[PDB]
């Protein structure tokens, strides 16, 4: 014959199906590792979110009333406490439309509406640092198998 070699073997692979992706393990993420006081200050300085942080006022009772406060504490007990409370407030209460009332970033409202801090982290991460390099290396390869005559 023409020696096609079994055939059936390369047919068995065509019985494969497309399986969905797994969530892996979504739960929490440290926002303070990417969200700096420079980002959180203008947002937490809004009365809209402050009002929602009232039932979650950080240790000390007196929460950062202005952006200068948050930008001063940097990553001190005040910031880490406020970060946690803010994360809880948006997750349970869901700020959603409140974020758009002050004209805050879309990344914030998307996450705050769902109450998902992971989506917020990813959005902020990629917003600040975009992934761009490109390295396909394809096309114009071919084989020229038949080409063997001179």
Swiss-Prot record:
DEUBAD domain segment(s): 20-134
Q: Where is this region: Interaction with UCHL5?
A: 3-150
Modified-residue entries (Phosphoserine), positions: 148
Where along the chain is composition biased (Basic and acidic residues)?
130-141
Residue ranges for the region (Disordered) are 122-150
UniProt's post-translational modification comment states: Ubiquitinated by UBE3C in response to proteotoxic stress.
Q: Which domain of life is it from?
A: Eukaryota
The record's subcellular location field reads: Cytoplasm; Nucleus
According to its record, what is known about the domains? The Pru (pleckstrin-like receptor for ubiquitin) domain mediates interactions with PSMD1 and ubiquitin. Preferential binding to the proximal subunit of 'Lys-48'-linked diubiquitin allows UCHL5 access to the distal subunit.
Q: What does this protein do?
A: Component of the 26S proteasome, a multiprotein complex involved in the ATP-dependent degradation of ubiquitinated proteins. This complex plays a key role in the maintenance of protein homeostasis by removing misfolded or damaged proteins, which could impair cellular functions, and by removing proteins whose functions are no longer required. Therefore, the proteasome participates in numerous cellular processes, including cell cycle progression, apoptosis, or DNA damage repair. Within the complex, functions as a proteasomal ubiquitin receptor.
Q: How does it assemble?
A: Component of the 19S proteasome regulatory particle complex. The 26S proteasome consists of a 20S core particle (CP) and two 19S regulatory subunits (RP). Interacts with the proteasomal scaffolding protein PSMD1. Interacts with deubiquitinase UCHL5; this interaction activates the auto-inhibited UCHL5 by deoligomerizing it. Interacts with UBQLN2 and ubiquitin.
Q: Which family does it belong to?
A: Belongs to the ADRM1 family.
Protein name per UniProt: Proteasomal ubiquitin receptor ADRM1
Gene for this protein?
ADRM1
Full protein stretch here: 260 to 407 of 407
């Amino acid at each position: 014959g023409s020696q096609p070699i079994q055939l059936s073997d390369l047919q068995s692979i065509l019985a494969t199906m497309n399986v969905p992706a797994g969530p892996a393990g979504g739960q929490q993420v440290d926002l303070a590792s990417v969200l700096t006081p420079e980002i959180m200050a203008p947002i937490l300085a809004n009365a809209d979110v402050q009002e929602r942080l009232l039932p979650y006022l950080p240790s000390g009772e007196s929460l950062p009333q202005t952006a200068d406060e948050i930008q001063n504490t940097l990553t001190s007990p005040q910031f880490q406490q406020a970060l946690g409370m803010f994360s809880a407030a948006l997750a349970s209460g869901q700020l959603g439309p409140l974020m758009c009332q002050f004209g805050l970033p879309a990344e914030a409202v998307e996450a705050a509406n769902k109450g998902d801090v992971e989506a917020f982290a990813k959005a902020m991460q990629n917003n600040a640092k975009p992934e761009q390099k490109e390295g396909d290396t394809k096309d114009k390869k071919d084989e020229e198998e038949d080409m063997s005559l001179d």
